[PDB]
Amino acid sequence: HGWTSKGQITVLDMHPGSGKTHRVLPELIRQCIDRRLRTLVLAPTRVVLKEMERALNGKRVRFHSGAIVDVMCHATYVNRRLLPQGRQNWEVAIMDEAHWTDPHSIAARGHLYTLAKENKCALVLMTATPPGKSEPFPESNGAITSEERQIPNGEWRDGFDWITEYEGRTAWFVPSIAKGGAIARTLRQKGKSVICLNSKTFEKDYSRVRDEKPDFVVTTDISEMGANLDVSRVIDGRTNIKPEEVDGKVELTGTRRVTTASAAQRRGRVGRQDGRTDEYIYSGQCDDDDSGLVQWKEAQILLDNITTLRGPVATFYGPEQDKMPEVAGHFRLTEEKRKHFRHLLTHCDFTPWLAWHVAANVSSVTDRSWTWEGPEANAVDEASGGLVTFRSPNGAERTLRPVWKDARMFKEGRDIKEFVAYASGRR
């Protein structure tokens, strides 16, 4: 009765240096291929999928963009299950970097957990910070000196000489793309090479880190899911952006303290070379209560729409179930509305929150009046001056003013011009 038995859940929590990708994953897959089990492997990012492809060199595996092993991203798995026909089951599921609080990652591990509890598959979660109780300063075979210092929260001129006098390469974690922009401006002004990694740039620019060896990588939490930045120092203000639903709108004002699992992953970027002691420089405390974030509602929206009313009630993975904001099934859509939802998610780059509000409520898929018929206060500032305006296909001038306002559609990685392409009926 081993790890590939239907209903077994294994958590592999090993640190860097224990052979996870190059020794442990290829052995897990060899056993699955030997036992002729249909096997699913989930990577968080295409970057990690490329590493797996190298580690699984010379095995019979299908990588998504004869084989009984399928390797794909967390998000690809969820987006496939939103299709009527995308619902074949695997007998063994292995999820890498399974701590990610991206909504698709939460719903993926919730779904696989639900199947494993109904004895439909075996589940392996691989993460150094399994969901549940975390420690901020885990001991490993890595050497890390952790020290608390005041850290700039934006541009600085004088002081903080320890930042620029350090010899060797740094990863600086920032709460948002905007804050990262500020830090990168000052670092470049002071003669340092900088690469910015975030939701928008990670998949394209991660490879530049190995190639260019910049003095600083200025990174959002995107780097907490398997990024090997080859740095000797982490700078960590221990903050993140706080997307939350307030008065029926998604807001992006100010910040929250990172979870302990997040602080541990940020610290976890260093300590990778046996024999070398690295630095983790931090400011302030962690906060484990992230239950107020819109990510839990978004993950329930996805999980509700990749399970059936007939199939028994789905849950988030073990301890995350306390953070499911409504009774399971609450956000389930009709086939017809789920087709609209999936289109907005996959073709229009909508957030789950906004794709759900639109698909659930709008009179028809080809209506765009919801983008200008909202309350006055839902307008968007235009960089060039005034409020954002566009022309409908009928040629009428509109002021962008959506019925459902999600601030994430207008900054933090997304351009207003892509949303105006939707609203103007060009997408």
UniProtKB/Swiss-Prot annotation:
Residues recorded as bearing N6-acetyllysine in the entry: 200
Position of sequence motif DEAH box: 96-99
PTM annotation, UniProt: Acetylated by host KAT5. Acetylation modulates NS3 RNA-binding and unwinding activities and plays an important positive role for viral replication.
Q: Which residues form the Helicase C-terminal domain?
A: 158-317
The record places the following residue ranges in the Cytoplasmic compartment, namely 2-427
- State where ATP binds: 14-21
| Site positions per UniProt: Involved in NS3 ATPase and RTPase activities | 266, 269
Q: Localized where?
A: Host endoplasmic reticulum membrane
Quaternary structure, from the entry: Forms a heterodimer with NS2B. Interacts with NS4B. Interacts with unphosphorylated RNA-directed RNA polymerase NS5; this interaction stimulates RNA-directed RNA polymerase NS5 guanylyltransferase activity.
Q: What does this protein do?
A: Displays three enzymatic activities: serine protease, NTPase and RNA helicase. NS3 serine protease, in association with NS2B, performs its autocleavage and cleaves the polyprotein at dibasic sites in the cytoplasm: C-prM, NS2A-NS2B, NS2B-NS3, NS3-NS4A, NS4A-2K and NS4B-NS5. NS3 RNA helicase binds RNA and unwinds dsRNA in the 3' to 5' direction.
Question: Protein name, please?
Answer: Serine protease NS3
Source organism of the structure? Tick-borne encephalitis virus (strain Hypr)
Q: Which residues of the whole protein does the chain here span?
A: 1676 to 2110 of 3414
